[PDB]
């Protein structure tokens with residue numbers, strides 16, 4: 078047999094993700110991480126798998142690790158913020174989305190109104206959660 082490289086495992090996971098096989102993709106990214114745990118994008122990609130599978134604590138842990146390895150990552154701040162938003166950690170989520178936005182502008186990766194839209198939605202969900210209380 079052949080043992081694929083971590084990079085090959087990441088690409089295989091990407092094809093599994095494109096194939097909408099999210100548990101399988103997550104496991105493949107996990108094999109990539111085992112082969113080389115110092116590459117942030119393996120964790121961010123697996124985090125997105127876990128968000129598609131609504132496995133929040135696993136996504137959260139992966140976003141934290143990705144950001145330890147690449148503190149400049151637009152994607153990992155965005156996914157961290159999305160995971161926090163879904164766990165109703167609103168203020169943390171918003172701050173991570175604002176950092177994703179600022180990093181994206183700096184890197185010229187701010188596409189359309191995407192991250193500002195995520196920020197508006199996060200802020201409105203936070204606002205609704207307070208406004209709806211008795």
Ligand SMILES: *CC(=O)Nc1ccc(NC(=O)C*)cc1
Nearest residue numbers: 091092093094095096097129
């Ligand atoms: C390749 C891939 O994952 N594409 C993709 C396209 C559209 C969406 N949008 C929604 O699910 C709303 C997700 C993934």
